[PDB]
């Protein structure tokens, strides 16, 4: 999910 | 302890005969004059932070490519609501507040309070949608589904319908806009019982709608992400840069929460303290204590989602150094 994280700018 | 008319309620009794409209008179009587320079000050505080960093945020969108993703257009949305807090209220106020009272009488009173109310409204539908967004995107809870371009739009007019059934009854016969506090902002009325246009309901679907319902989605999305986060590092604790992840995760979401509720929790619970022990003697500056949270938001939202971005940040110190960085 370190792929979606960076999409929504959480990490 | 008041004094009515046909388009206002100034919390000030009148036994002195000292009591003009708000749209008319300078209302020194229910504060000093100190007092109205101090509301002007904050205003243009809230002008000179609140215009800089929410601009901005569309100026770097506008130079870097990076930024200019589906998954970021809310962001830019809550930047516009930002803006129409700033220059549909926040200046207005400190024109007005400089003369003492509301110089442009009650269609400026219907203006000045719907925009106001729609850009804080845009705000809050961009928060509640951004968590969506987050929940769907990051907890995986559809088969087959990614986030594209025409969601994104979607949830952004959903933002505005949502603002717009939210600002709009006041101005044709549900609720009503009237100057609050020291009469020099307007907003919706919640501090008289005005059966002409049924304020009582117009309150409980405010209440209801627009808070428990934005309370409970954000909270739901952001408890399933903190969730989700934390089941994957725990399958995943060879890799440090996961636990890196959950932690941050974490950290932000308590932020955005508890920002959440310093925002819009003192306006709910005011108002509904104003409509449930209604009414009563209500200094104009216990008046302006939730609207003062509320209205600082346009200053830290931005500052939370969009300064607290790692790809936004980079790209706003490339563009204010000019170059590098
Ligand atoms: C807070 O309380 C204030 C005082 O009770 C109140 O102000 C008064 O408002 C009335 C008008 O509704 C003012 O009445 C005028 O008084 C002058 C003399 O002092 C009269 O000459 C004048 O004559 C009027 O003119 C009409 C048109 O030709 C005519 O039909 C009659 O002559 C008619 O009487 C008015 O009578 C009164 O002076 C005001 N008081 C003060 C102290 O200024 C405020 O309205 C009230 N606040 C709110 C928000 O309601
Ligand atoms: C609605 C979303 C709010 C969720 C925030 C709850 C965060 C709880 O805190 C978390 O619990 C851990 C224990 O596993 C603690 O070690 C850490 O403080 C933190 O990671
Ligand atoms: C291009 O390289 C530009 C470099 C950045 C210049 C340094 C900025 C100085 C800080 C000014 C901010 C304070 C303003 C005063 C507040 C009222
Ligand atoms: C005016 C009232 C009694 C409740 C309003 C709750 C607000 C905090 C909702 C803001 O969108």
Same mark, same amino acid.
């Given at each position: 999910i370190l792929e979606n994280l960076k999409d929504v700018g959480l990490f | 302890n008041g004094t009515e008319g046909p388009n206002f309620y100034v919390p000030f009794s009148n036994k002195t005969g000292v009591v003009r409209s708000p749209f008319e008179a300078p209302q020194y009587y229910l504060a000093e004059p100190w007092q109205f320079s101090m509301l002007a000050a904050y205003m243009f505080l809230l002008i000179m932070l609140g215009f800089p960093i929410n601009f901005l945020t569309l100026y770097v969108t506008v130079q870097h490519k990076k930024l200019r993703t589906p998954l970021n257009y809310i962001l830019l949305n809550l930047a516009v609501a930002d803006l129409f807090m700033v220059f549909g209220g926040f200046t207005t106020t400190l024109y007005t507040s400089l003369h003492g009272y509301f110089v442009f009488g009650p269609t400026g009173c219907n203006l000045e309070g719907f925009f106001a109310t729609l850009g804080?409204? %845009? =705000? +809050? !539908?961009?928060?509640?949608?951004? @968590? %969506?967004?987050? &929940?769907? /995107?990051? #907890?995986?809870?559809?088969?087959? *589904?990614? $986030?594209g371009e025409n969601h994104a739009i979607m949830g952004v007019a959903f933002t505005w319908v949502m603002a717009l059934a939210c600002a709009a009854p006041?101005? /044709?016969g549900w609720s009503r806009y009237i100057?609050?506090?020291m009469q020099c902002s307007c907003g919706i009325d919640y501090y008289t019982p005005h059966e002409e246009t049924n304020n009582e309901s117009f309150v409980i679907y405010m209440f209801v709608v627009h808070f428990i319902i934005p309370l409970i989605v954000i909270f739901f #999305? &952001?408890?399933? +992400?903190? $969730?989700?986060?934390?089941? @994957?590092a725990a399958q995943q604790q060879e890799s440090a840069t996961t636990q890196k992840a959950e932690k941050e995760v974490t950290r932000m979401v308590i932020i955005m929460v508890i920002a959440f509720? %310093? #925002? !819009?929790?003192? &306006? @709910?619970?005011?108002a509904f303290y104003i409509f449930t022990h209604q009414g009563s003697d209500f200094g104009p500056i216990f008046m302006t204590i939730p =609207? $003062? *949270?509320a209205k600082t938001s346009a200053v830290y939202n931005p500052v939370i989602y969009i300064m607290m971005n790692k790809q936004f940040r980079n790209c706003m110190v490339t563009t204010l150094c000019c170059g590098k960085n």
């Open positions: - | 804080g409204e %845009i =705000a +809050l !539908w961009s928060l509640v949608v951004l @968590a %969506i967004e987050r &929940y769907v /995107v990051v #907890c995986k809870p559809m088969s087959n *589904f990614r $986030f006041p101005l /044709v100057p609050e506090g #999305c &952001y408890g399933q +992400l903190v $969730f989700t986060v934390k089941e @994957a509720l %310093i #925002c !819009w929790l003192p &306006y @709910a619970g005011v =609207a $003062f *949270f």
